[PDB]
């Protein structure tokens, strides 16, 4: 509000809030973001700007309270979106209305480019299929639904050329990446399904689970660089972090945080800092996204962490671990618990970190903006 | 007018060349007395005229170049040019 | 010119012959030496601070001339016989010890020579703590005097008669050794340098006395070395110096107590620096650490200071060439930043050179 | 890393992170210029300007400046509040953004 970190009461559902690369990946500091207005009266994408401390690139004044720089309107709904380009933003809907908007950097405004009223088409037109998670990469944008419905769009043309509508069990919420011909989907119980680019008929291809602890998986995200790196956060913690994309059943088991994790975000600039939110009002910051071998920032959690340089050994006889294969002990480290906020907020929905600023939308219709001080 | 992005890598030779080009264009594109005085002072200093001056005045005339070379004792250059 | 010429070998014979080719020429040279040593650097008149800069410039020129003369002397003494040191000092080595050092040198009424000048510059003042008047005037005079004494004592056939005459005159060794510790100085570097030189010449005198079996001299040296309380100058000699505890260690009886304070060696140790002076050639912190380490590894070559540092202008030229060879097309507003970085690096390497001189003085001590 | 292609965003960001971890500058500038010319070919003026101000280059900056000049001469486009939202070294590298900022400040005053 007027002291310490920024706290605003926008009084609206904080669905999908993501920082745009307009003020990022440049000399300017990140401060401009976008928010979808899902579960409201009118699903509108609003571009806002926060107020950070100091002034390194003509930042906002006061002590906080973000302000809406612009807003766009569309008859479709708002689910989520993945920043494929700085000026292109593709948002899906649960009623089959894909909105591709054109953001002008030289104008700081939004223009309605494409509104696919007949999206998810491949053998005709006028098709309505709900969507749950839409993620983009080079050169395909993949959207998943609830009953296993998959939709694929190209980045070089404005058309849909792949719509697979099968009959799957349970419910799938989220989608990660692997390569140009593999898709890994998580279930709401603890199952992992591996599908190919050319799959016909019912019956999933490969289904795997984790022995021991099986909690409902919730949020799942992919690494912006290596696609085979997956960060998952569910109920009591059950992610299968792996630096590859082979093997049958996942040999990794990282069980921590009994509270339900609703979203786990990555650092877009330097993909080596993960930020995880808790349902009891907690924000954990993990370092070294598995592949990055560096000294860990404090332990915490049932994980193997990473190894660094070792020197100064006694003239006796030491050891250097061993080799074992089991589906119970962890294999890849990732969780680095950092005590930041034990219990301050009654509920927390989503969070997003960029450069040195973290936005956090809570379930009580509020937003918090905090400038990081650690590393 | 900074058409090409200036930098501390390239020396001031091209800068002076573009400056002379702009000055000649602002003054007169037909009068060659300025070029004459410039090349005369350069030869008095002790260095032949640059290659782009050579190309420009060769596309202009030729007999004047031959006469100036014969007067300034550039026998080999004048012989090659007349050949 | 003479110092730049005297750099080969087997050339000093010509000048040795031309120094004594004629008795009249030698007498005229001696008269000129007397006239030049009569007055060359007088206090107040020539050593002023409120008058003009002409006197200061003349004194600096005379000091540089003395530096070059001492350099020529040590360069001629470093080689084998013959040497120009004896010819320039006026006392050769072919004559016996009884006739080498003339007894008339140090009476203030005889032909002025090097010994007369040394007596005139080392007799005025207080020959006790904090040195006499030479340290108050210019410590470089005491520095060059200690250097000359060390160069004369390093030789086997020259250390004997020198200290013999110094002791038979007015006991100059005691007055020279009583200067510790030094207090009237302009820099701790010069202070510890003077302390190290005086300790070196005192140790070489102690070694020569122990080799020649001088019990009284060794006793006096050990007393002056292990003396704690500031004693008083005495003159009772049982054989050739101090031997009892009442004439050399009178400070204890004067203060009616004894401890570990106000001692010469203790004050020297408290004056010398304790921190380590690590000299760094080049250190940058404005770009990437990889490029910084690469530039540091590339700029590694010997010079004149003794370390892997470069010239004050050559390092900046190399840095300019390096930051110029790795560019693109846009380079506006970077020249003032580069100049500021060059100035900061120059100040840094100047401070590191000062630390290197401090470390060299500490290593000498 | 300069011979491998740097066209797709995935491998572009991969090489960018690789050279950033290696702590280099020439490779960073080369990747930025490549992605800037790609954005210019794909008609992305804002992305090209961001890449140019990241690479500290002025060629693409002056190109976008001349594009803005001819756009204003054709129709008159001046509503550019990006400079008022955020600043940096682009106003020193170019002159069109500085002119737009000065015009907006003059209008507000």
UniProtKB/TrEMBL annotation, chain A:
<feature type="repeat" description="WD">
    <location>
        <begin position="254"/>
        <end position="296"/>
    </location>
</feature>
<dbReference type="InterPro" id="IPR015943">
    <property type="entry name" value="WD40/YVTN_repeat-like_dom_sf"/>
</dbReference>
<keyword id="KW-0853">WD repeat</keyword>
<keyword id="KW-0677">Repeat</keyword>
<protein>
    <submittedName>
        <fullName>MGC154553 protein</fullName>
    </submittedName>
</protein>
<dbReference type="InterPro" id="IPR036322">
    <property type="entry name" value="WD40_repeat_dom_sf"/>
</dbReference>
<dbReference type="InterPro" id="IPR019775">
    <property type="entry name" value="WD40_repeat_CS"/>
</dbReference>
<dbReference type="InterPro" id="IPR001680">
    <property type="entry name" value="WD40_rpt"/>
</dbReference>
<feature type="repeat" description="WD">
    <location>
        <begin position="210"/>
        <end position="252"/>
    </location>
</feature>
<dbReference type="GO" id="GO:0031080">
    <property type="term" value="C:nuclear pore outer ring"/>
</dbReference>
<dbReference type="Pfam" id="PF00400">
    <property type="entry name" value="WD40"/>
</dbReference>
<dbReference type="GO" id="GO:0005829">
    <property type="term" value="C:cytosol"/>
</dbReference>
<keyword id="KW-0539">Nucleus</keyword>
TrEMBL record, chain B:
<protein>
    <submittedName>
        <fullName>Nucleoporin 160kDa</fullName>
    </submittedName>
</protein>
UniProtKB/TrEMBL annotation, chain C:
<protein>
    <submittedName>
        <fullName>MGC83295 protein</fullName>
    </submittedName>
</protein>
<comment type="similarity">
    <text>Belongs to the NUP186/NUP192/NUP205 family.</text>
</comment>
């Amino acid at each position: 509000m007027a002291d310490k970190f920024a706290a605003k009461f926008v009084s609206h559902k904080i669905s999908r809030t993501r920082w745009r690369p307009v003020s990022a990946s440049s000399l300017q500091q990140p401060d401009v973001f976008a928010t979808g207005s899902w579960d409201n009266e009118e699903n509108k994408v609003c571009v806002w700007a926060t107020s950070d401390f100091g002034a390194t690139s003509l930042d906002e004044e006061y002590q906080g309270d973000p302000k809406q720089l612009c807003d766009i309107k569309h008859p479709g709904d708002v689910m989520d979106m993945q920043f494929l380009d700085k000026e292109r933003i593709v948002t899906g809907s649960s009623t089959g209305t894909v909105t591709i908007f054109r953001h002008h950097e030289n104008n700081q405004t939004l223009s309605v480019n494409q509104r696919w009223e007949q999206a998810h088409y491949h053998v005709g037109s006028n098709m309505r299929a709900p969507c749950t998670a839409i993620v983009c990469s080079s050169p395909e944008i993949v959207s998943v639904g609830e009953d296993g419905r998959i939709n694929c769009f190209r980045a070089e043309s404005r058309d849909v050329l792949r719509t697979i509508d099968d009959a799957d069990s349970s419910t799938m919420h989220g989608v990660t990446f692997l390569r140009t011909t593999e898709i890994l989907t998580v279930n709401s119980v603890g199952q992992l399904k591996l599908w190919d680019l050319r799959k016909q008929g019912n019956d999933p291809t490969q289904i795997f689970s984790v022995t021991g602890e099986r909690v409902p998986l919730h949020c799942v995200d992919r690494h912006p660089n290596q696609q085979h790196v997956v960060a998952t956060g569910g109920q009591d913690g059950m992610l299968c972090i792996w630096d590859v994309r082979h093997g049958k059943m996942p040999m990794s088991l990282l069980n921590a945080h009994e509270a339900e994790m609703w979203e786990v975000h990555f650092h877009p600039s330097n993909p080596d800092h993960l930020f995880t939110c808790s349902e009891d009002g907690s924000l954990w910051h993990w370092d070294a996204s598995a592949d990055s071998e560096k000294p860990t920032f404090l332990l915490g959690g049932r994980s193997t962490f990473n190894i660094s340089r070792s020197s100064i050994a006694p003239p006796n006889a030491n050891q250097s671990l061993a080799c074992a294969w089991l589906s119970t002990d962890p294999t890849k480290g990732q969780l680095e618990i950092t005590n930041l906020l034990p219990s301050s907020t009654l509920s927390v929905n989503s969070l997003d970190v960029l450069g040195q600023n973290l936005v956090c939308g809570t379930d009580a219709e509020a937003i918090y903006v905090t400038r990081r001080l650690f590393s | 007018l900074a058409t090409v992005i200036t930098t501390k890598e390239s020396s001031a030779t091209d800068e002076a060349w573009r400056l002379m080009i702009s000055y000649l264009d602002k003054y007169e594109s037909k009068n060659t007395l300025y070029h004459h005085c410039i090349i005369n002072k350069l030869l008095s200093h002790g260095v032949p005229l640059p290659n782009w001056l050579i190309n420009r005045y060769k596309a202009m005339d030729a007999a004047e170049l031959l006469r100036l070379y014969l007067k300034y004792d550039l026998l080999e250059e004048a012989a090659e040019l007349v050949l | 010119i003479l110092c730049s010429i005297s750099c080969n070998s087997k050339i000093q014979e010509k000048i040795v012959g031309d120094f004594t080719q004629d008795q009249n020429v030698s007498q005229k040279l001696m008269v000129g030496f007397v006239s030049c040593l009569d007055s060359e650097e007088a206090e107040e008149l020539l050593d002023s601070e409120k008058e003009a800069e002409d006197q200061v410039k003349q004194t600096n020129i005379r000091y540089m001339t003395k530096i070059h003369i001492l350099n020529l002397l040590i360069t001629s003494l470093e080689m084998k016989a013959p040497n120009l040191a004896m010819f320039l000092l006026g006392y050769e080595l072919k004559k016996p010890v009884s006739t080498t050092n003339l007894q008339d040198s140090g009476v203030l009424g005889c032909p002025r020579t090097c010994l007369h000048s040394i007596l005139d510059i080392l007799r005025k003042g207080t020959d006790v703590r904090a040195g006499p008047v030479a340290v108050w005037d210019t410590p470089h005079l005491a520095e060059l005097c200690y250097q000359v004494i060390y160069q004369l004592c390093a030789c086997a056939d020259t250390s004997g008669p020198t200290m013999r005459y110094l002791r038979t005159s007015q006991d100059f060794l005691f007055s020279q050794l009583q200067h510790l510790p030094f207090s009237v100085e302009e820099s701790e570097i010069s202070a510890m340098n003077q302390m190290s030189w005086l300790m070196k010449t005192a140790t070489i005198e102690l070694r020569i006395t122990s080799l020649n079996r001088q019990r009284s001299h060794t006793q006096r040296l050990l007393h002056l070395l292990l003396d704690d309380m500031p004693t008083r100058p005495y003159s009772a000699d049982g054989e050739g110096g101090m031997e009892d505890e009442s004439r050399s260690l009178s400070g204890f009886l004067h203060f009616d107590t004894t401890s570990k304070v106000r001692r010469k060696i203790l004050r020297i140790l408290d004056s010398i620096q304790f921190s380590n002076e690590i000299p760094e050639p080049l250190q940058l912190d404005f770009f990437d650490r990889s490029q910084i380490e690469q530039v540091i590894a590339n700029c590694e070559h010997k010079n004149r200071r003794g370390q892997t540092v470069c010239n004050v202008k050559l390092l900046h030229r190399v840095l300019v060439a390096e930051v110029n060879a790795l560019q693109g097309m846009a380079a506006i507003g970077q020249r003032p930043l580069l100049m500021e970085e060059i100035n900061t690096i120059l100040q840094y390497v100047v401070e590191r050179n000062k630390l290197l001189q401090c470390l060299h003085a500490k290593r000498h001590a | 890393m300069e011979r491998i292609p740097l066209s797709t965003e995935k491998k572009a960001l991969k090489a960018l992170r690789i050279c950033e971890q290696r702590q280099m500058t020439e490779q960073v500038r080369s990747i930025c210029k490549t992605m800037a010319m790609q954005s210019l070919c794909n008609r992305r003026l804002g992305s090209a300007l961001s890449w140019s101000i990241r690479a500290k280059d002025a060629a693409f900056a002056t190109l976008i400046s001349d594009r803005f000049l001819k756009e204003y001469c054709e129709r008159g486009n001046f509503t550019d509040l990006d400079l008022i939202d955020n600043l940096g070294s682009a106003m020193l590298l170019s002159d069109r953004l500085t002119f737009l900022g000065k015009y907006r400040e003059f209008h507000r005053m």
